[model samples]
Target chain A: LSSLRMAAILDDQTVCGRGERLALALAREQINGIIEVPAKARVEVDIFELQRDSQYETTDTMCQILPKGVVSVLGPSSSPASASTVSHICGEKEIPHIKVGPEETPLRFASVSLYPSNEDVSLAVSRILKSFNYPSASLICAKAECLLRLEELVRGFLISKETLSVRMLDSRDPTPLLKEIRDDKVSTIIIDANASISHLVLRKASELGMTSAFYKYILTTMDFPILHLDGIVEDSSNILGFSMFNTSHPFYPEFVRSLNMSWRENCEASTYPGPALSAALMFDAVHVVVSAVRELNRSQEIGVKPLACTSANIWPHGTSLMNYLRMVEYDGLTGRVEFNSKGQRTNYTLRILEKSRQGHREIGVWYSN
Target chain B: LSSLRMAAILDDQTVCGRGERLALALAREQINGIIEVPAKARVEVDIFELQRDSQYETTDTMCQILPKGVVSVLGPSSSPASASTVSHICGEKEIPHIKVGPEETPLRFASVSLYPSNEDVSLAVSRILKSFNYPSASLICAKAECLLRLEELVRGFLISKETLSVRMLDSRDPTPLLKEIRDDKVSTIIIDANASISHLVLRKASELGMTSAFYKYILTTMDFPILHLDGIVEDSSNILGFSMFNTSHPFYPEFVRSLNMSWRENCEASTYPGPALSAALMFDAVHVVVSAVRELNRSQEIGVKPLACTSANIWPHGTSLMNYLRMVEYDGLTGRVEFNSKGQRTNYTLRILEKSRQGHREIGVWYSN
Candidate 1:
């Protein structure tokens, strides 16, 4: 079934931090693909530009001329994507999208998946939860794509309270759902809401004297007790607080090898760079996809084609490569890593370090029990 | 009369900077007084005592406690006389005073009249006038206390059309003067004004496409241009960018010393550090009465007693000592610093540095030529 090499389009427009490294590695290892970048990244039309160029209309016109073969677009790092910043891009492009941090994708991107199901997510979530004394919690999601399955080791531990409640907030009206749990007595109430609004709501709840554990999409510091799954990155940490652990499959191992990053060997002692050391596992998923495609294409002796030719006969798709490699062990930047049947990565850990005015940065370990 | 020992009360309880430094250098060279600086300054007050004490009903009660022998009080360093930041002792006393800089005296003092004469004022005014490019300018002060003997220099210069028609503003009420010059077609206007009202006038003038200059009291970035001055040390420069230069007696020699700071000089080019320096020149004038007193005391081994203290033996009254050295010839900081009959220290030069929003800084030098 694996005959010709299929191109994998790694979309990494609006690059920030190391998101592009993971995407670039995915492109290099999986599908023998090429990465094309543009001068201006448009996830939405800037309102000011529209005000100046009033005659031209619609955001679709703004996005179509972009470089082709972008199968997945990774980032638009800034938060609070208002009408001015990214609405036009979101409304125009139908590409599969992921919000790298804790933000919900703009409603326009139809198939939106925020990258929290990766191994890094479990590790970060577990550590912060344990440190905050939130032993157990529930998976909450508004869109099915956001639902996360914690590793089996962390599955059924009871929260301090009877049943933890987390509402997958409606994209358009998260306030109504927030109001529902306002006065309720619960040990922990995790809101699978967007970060800015979630923080704002949590702060407001705190003002009302409501105290409880909450599951956070990112381990950013907040006055109220909330656990961020994503870890904080340095530099931008002062302002953005924390960032989602960015990663990809197939080519992830090679990327890890290039950087010589290892996790298991560092287990007895805390390792890698920063609070997100373990949270970095998800990017390996991208590595998995890339590795499977490259191996299958070579074994089948498939010829590489010109870039951006989205035709059938892609080796990995035809070979069912990801399924074959399901149980296979691989070296990752974090350690030897693998994924379960549900497409969730494993062998992850989370650490919470120092709590400062800026946010909670991982100085040491606070593991998920 | 000469006094060998000198002391400084660094706090210009009502004033600071050179004023504070001068008091110290003067006393250090002559008075044999002690400069008491707290290891960690604090002006702690008994709040309950203040509320209950009738004899100290007013804030000045603390000032009364100071010993009678203390000749002068220097500063509070910071302003807002009653502000919490004023040195602990100064604020508690609530003495009738003008605050100077940070960390100040804890005593009662009276004003003395060694203020700048017209010649001193001339140096500063000429510099400021030249800096803003006001040609053939004229400056007038209604208050005699602040007047400088500047008529000759003002007359010798040519007032360009811009300068003649230039607004002559009162430091107190600049509005009427501004109105008169509004139609005068002046290129520039300067007011030796107070900082408190300068903001209002500048902001108002800017609305009319015109700008005004002001004279304020400043402290740090001592001799630098306005834009370079640090606000905490020099609030006047921080606010309106114009102020008087109360150049110290030793300033000239200090400038020379500064020029030689980094270089090792050749025998022919090197200069000795003595009265030959510019600042040392002023000792020949009334400016150096204290200096002469110190030299006399050191030579005669006389103690500060009976007020019989000079070549003329009338040192008890500061002015009586001044008359003894009005025109005495002695090498001073500026080679041969002198004092005219007007009591203005001679051989001194003053310059003002102009500041602009585009970051342009230029020094304006003024001389008889």
Candidate 2:
């Protein structure tokens, strides 16, 4: 008559109640129906809705909850304060901490990221650039944080001895942007900016008569569907971007419908017409824990402890759960969800999208193994 | 036995379910507590959690629910699809649709925006610029939508026949950006990009040695507190921005505590640490409607109709609700919540922020009346 408890720290105020509700509903739905585990194990979740930017609160919340003895923790996805804090503590305590976002550099210890590995995405970008056989390229980045990822990608390219010039979007003037692209005669350009900024960049390029067949642009934001194309009247320009999730996946629609139904039953209204990426991740994170717990129950006695942040008292089942989580794999709403030893999701697929007269069209798929 | 019912259209999954929950909570709290309005008014919310980009679903949701004969509608703020769709129908039907985002060019008829008017925000930027005047200034923008506001500000300045140079952040290179600023000797620059992008711009400027006392940058994003200032070390450079809310207001802490308590009691958990900005606006939006309902009850019999989107049958109380909503003014979470003839909130205050070594410090205030 033992039960396994997992906790989630999410900003209930950010993406609405979508993330929290999905996490809870999916955990209950999956665990109760799971017959693989012999023990009558139940997944109990404590949902905390911290403000978006409150890092201290996130740290405090994790410390406060760690004593309650959770085998694993999921979320605080939107806030760096909570995400990093959770990662550090979970690593220190050997508890599995699942993060869902664009894959970052793999944490050395117990931090498992649901985001695609940055190395894989960089490889995809590099391969795409190489296939086009552009002599030299320019990287136009709007965010410094994104620049870190761009740097990693560039480093990967440099190992292959590929040279790419990098520049920050000098918002003070576009003359530099125009001059750099024209001066270097760089035809292939990779842009990393949000949707609104990307629209402006395209407009400015068109105004400068740079949107013709010769100049190619690749966007790095996931908001391709919503990006408004201004001034690109003809389909002559080769504009492309990346999508994290495949809309064409056979199970995608059913997942959306089911998630929508669950939302209605729990919250008493239909707020989400489709499963948002975050909600999908939360749902998957819960399944991940359930799968791991089921695996752990086979060999070891699952137990937790009143661990303290200051003291070295760690949960007894932490390492076993962490190992189980790393080895766990499932077909999730986000496609085939599996993790490497580094706790990074690998062997997943990313969609390469091209801008057409109608809208964004998925031209190719890049698989990360 | 007559009960006046109001409806709301919101993405229950967005804004952390704050707007949807607050609108519901405040409505019930107000209706049960208030004795001035003898008519028993009930607020029934029809929450819609549409995908972030599903404007069609939003429009359809509004159309589907409009026939339910509600006196007013609140929200769907995150989706432009729902906001504008709800606004259009409410205008045609003369039903009050309350929006809690920044006031744009006001809706012509029945829609009301609780956000501070863009005109006022523009004035605040101008006043801050004029106060720190150099010989000339340049406008740095990354988003095209923000350009409209910049244009408005420029037009306002043009009354004195003053001219300013406009430019885009050259993400491709800074050679031309540096050249333009140095060549034109433009020291004063106004920047309008989101936080992460802004961080990149400042970091790039520093790499190019642009963050000195000679250069002044004004940021337009409200996320100044969270923006990472990586390279900029000294407080010698003039970095400024604007904030929509007054966190230092005496009533702010008590309001936060009350909101936290309410969330804890109703949801059976301490999910929210404070009243998020959207929640505050949602709280105010509900109060606005309640006030309008109270006013409507005083002068006229409050009732709705079994109206349809296609049919000519409209809510008889629509116009009266609209009128009362426009004139309804009171101090709420977001300062003074009042609307003009055009249904736009005007005559509010914005805080001017300056970046010191300590961090962002509020230097002055701008009033829009």
Candidate 3:
């Protein structure tokens, strides 16, 4: 589960998502904190359903290996519940589970459950939605299951329910769907879809006065979404350029100047910041899971006498798991992992994926809060 | 799930078991061959139940990262059918199960089952019953669950019924009961119990006797009774040894010796031999489970598009996962792993366990077929 979608040019592979952004940060941000996971602990992520037979067998066998042996599981944030299922199973088995989702479950067995907090995801969605100036909107995608579930949960907050669209596309081609929607006033397009469709459809929608597109596949899309939150999370002008209105935002107060600055930062003479930005998010999650498990194991006498391992004795273990989690202060490849009672981390920021004049992609700017 | 159990010396802190023995065997045998197990594969061997809360957990966890993450589970071999239950839970979760018992559960989800094919356990009982060689007779200090059930089965093979004295003791203080039966003409004091009790009672009984005594814990002890069969196509010493003895046999010579030999061979230079012997017999079963999963997965088409997964493709995947063990081989740490039609390996041998001056253990001195 550790592999990622790589956007490659010819043979050179560039990973997608925040991890790739972290890579860009390392390459251009003059940041040396970026690190490659130790080979033994490094994982190659892939979809469970799409894995090769041998790979599937390998994974099944790996899954059977006492969970204590595995460090973590990482991949794209597709199905939040799918990630939660892993946590559930791992929890039931009294093993640590780490993935993206709500940490609502009793994580006794699972190590960690990760995902943008409901507030974080919602705020990001709202900013993206408002950017398109759409008082009402709808989401379009293909197929259903994990993605559909997320769309339904988030629908209540939108302003105009009537204009909201969550439709599936029959083919990779999204032109037909765009052609059907003649109401040009529907400027906001929320591409809450899976795979390349979001980019494919949004690019077509951009042709019809679709001022802005909000993407759920943040990790895979070549076009980086601008941060709607206050404070300069990243410099967007490096790739996304100015959003027409705010050029003096903290991220790149002078949008035109930051665009040129981002270019100089990517040159071999300057520091590369791409890898750092992308890798930071994953690293923070890793730190959280490790801290939680350590606390759980230490506080509770897991493999000890029942009398010695009463609920009272075990309480400390659980507390310790959550306590050390609060102690994370350093930027863990991305940033810190301190969270509140709602289990929301306050220190998350955004990064922009940019390309050189030569067309080589690099992730450097952070603009979201 | 991760801990170790050592024959703790009152003044010394050195932990014992397979790890120490494996080190010793390094001089006598190319232990690397015996120790080499596939990645994600697990080795299951049973210990006494009372001890489960302790030592067994330790051993399984210590070697988890070694040889690149091969996991181990202590088998449920205390009762005649407990092994079947191991198969039940592990099968449900797609985890491999390996068990050894007097009778193989023909319908079990156990990837592999090990047992005496013929009639060794019964014959051995009959032989001792006729001789009244109480000290020389195998004494089984098993759990109440397995003992009571085995009692009914033992009644069928009675040597004039009057001579047989089957008894159960509080697994904790079996010595008092041992004192009562010590004078009885029971040559082999069999401890029909879990690993802890078997290890505890047998060692205590042997010390009380002040002589070397033979004992078997009868692994795979559980409530779920399994289908017993006559024999598999391939030749196996444990199976043959079991076949050699029956309810009417004069000694416990059949499959009993095969397991005994395995014990001895695995502990060639050590002071303890039982668990090693148990592990060797169990290892072959481990091989069987992997092969079964391979076969199950192979029958099905592995990847997407051509969803024509064959029988082997039936391996644990998607809904209703199944075992699909296929081609692979490992040098038995003590015996051999030759897969048969039942997704079981039908090859094994007999060995003996001997003690050393330092109180360490080893598996050597082959048991004659």
* TM-score of chain B in each prediction: 0.42, 0.78, 0.44
- Listed models, DockQ each: 0.00, 0.01, 0.01
**Candidate 3, residues A219-285: lDDT per residue as tens digits?**
2221233222112122331223111112233332232233335445445423322232223344345
Q: lDDT of candidate 1 vs native?
A: 0.33
Instruction: Give per-residue CA lDDT, model 2, range B146-225, as digits (tens).
Output: 54444347434322233355556636554466556656676777777766577777777777777778888888765565
| Model 2: residue A209 alpha-carbon error in angstroms | 5.0
As a whole number from 0 to 100, the lDDT of residue B103 in candidate 3 is 49
Q: Which digits, one per residue and each the tens of the lDDT, describe model 2 over residues A17-120? A: 45456546655666677565344776677676776454446767888888887878888755654587678778777888888756432135667877666566
> How many clashes would you count in candidate 1?
72
The top-ranked prediction according to lDDT is: 2
Please give the distance, in angstroms, between residue B108's alpha carbon in candidate 3 and its true position after superposition: 31
Interface RMSD of 1: 40.2
**Each model's C-alpha lDDT?**
0.33, 0.67, 0.35
Residue B312 Cα positional deviation in candidate 2, in Å, after optimal superposition: 57
lDDT of 1 at B312: 29
Model 3, residue A275: distance off in Å is 4.1
lDDT of 3 by residue, B138-175 (tens): 33435333322343223232211123344556345777
What lDDT tens digits, residue by residue, belong to model 1 across residues A198-252?
A: 5555455445544323323232322111233232322222111223232344444
